[PDB]
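[job 0412] stage=fold_complex status=start
inputs:
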Amino acid sequence: VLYVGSKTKEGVVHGVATVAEKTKEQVTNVGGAVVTGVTAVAQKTVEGAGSIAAATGFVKKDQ
Amino acid sequence: VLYVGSKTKEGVVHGVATVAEKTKEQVTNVGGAVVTGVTAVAQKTVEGAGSIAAATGFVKKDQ
Amino acid sequence: VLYVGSKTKEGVVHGVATVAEKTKEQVTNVGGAVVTGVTAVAQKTVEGAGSIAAATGFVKKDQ
Amino acid sequence: VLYVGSKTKEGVVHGVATVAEKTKEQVTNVGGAVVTGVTAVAQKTVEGAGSIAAATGFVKKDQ
Amino acid sequence: VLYVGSKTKEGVVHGVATVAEKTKEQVTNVGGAVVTGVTAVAQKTVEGAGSIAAATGFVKKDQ
Amino acid sequence: VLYVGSKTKEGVVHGVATVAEKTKEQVTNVGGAVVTGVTAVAQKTVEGAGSIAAATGFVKKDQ
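[job 0412] stage=fold_complex status=done
writing structure:
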């Protein structure tokens, strides 16, 4: 039994329980961004930019 | 039993339980972006940009 | 039983329980960004910028 | 809209979510009783004895 | 809108979320009773004895 | 809008979240009773004896 580098975990989610009782729920958007209700999300990025719940109003790049 | 680098987990989700009782639910959008209700999502990117729940109003790139 | 560098955990979430009873819930957005309700999120980035719940009104880059 | 006695609920179960990851599971019985794993069970009894998960080793009634 | 006695709830379960990760699980019984793992159970009894998870070694009634 | 006696709740359970990570779990019984792991249980009894998780070694009634 030797185990060279192993049994690793990167960007891992487990054993999650969730209840969400909500009577009324409204989202009103006029331009821009809305992100609501992200749960149990796992991600691994290599040589790149990672974003899970990112909201931006607007990205202007003129010249 | 030797186990060179193995038994790895990257971007993994397991064992998730979820209840969502909601009476009324509205989403109103006039331009822009809305992202609601992302659950149990796993992703692995190599040499690229990762995004799970990303919202942007608008991307303008003039010249 | 030797265990060279192993049994590691990076960006890991487990054993989470959550209840959210909410009668009324409103989100009103006029430009900009709103991020509400991120739970049980794990991420690992290599050679890149990480962001979990990032909100920006607007990104202007002129020239 | 009058609603004489109505909209009642008696012995009711709803909105249940469950995960059960189990590698090995053994049950060994030599006489007696074993009850394992009762979930999401509803019952209504009138003029009688109710029992959901009842175990008895043995019922002797001599004379 | 009058609502004589109504909208009642008796013996009710709702909005339940549950995770159970278990590697090994053994139950050994030699006479008697074992009850393991009762979840989300609702019952209503009228004019009778109610029991949800009842275990008895043995019931002897001589004469 | 009058609401004679209504909107009642008797023996009610809701909005429950639960995680149970357990590696090894043993139960050994030699006569008697064992009750393990009762969760989210609701009951209403009328004109009778109520018991949720009751364990008795043995009930002898001689004469």
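[job 0412] summary: Chains D and C do not touch (no CB pair under 8 Å).
[job 0412] exit 0
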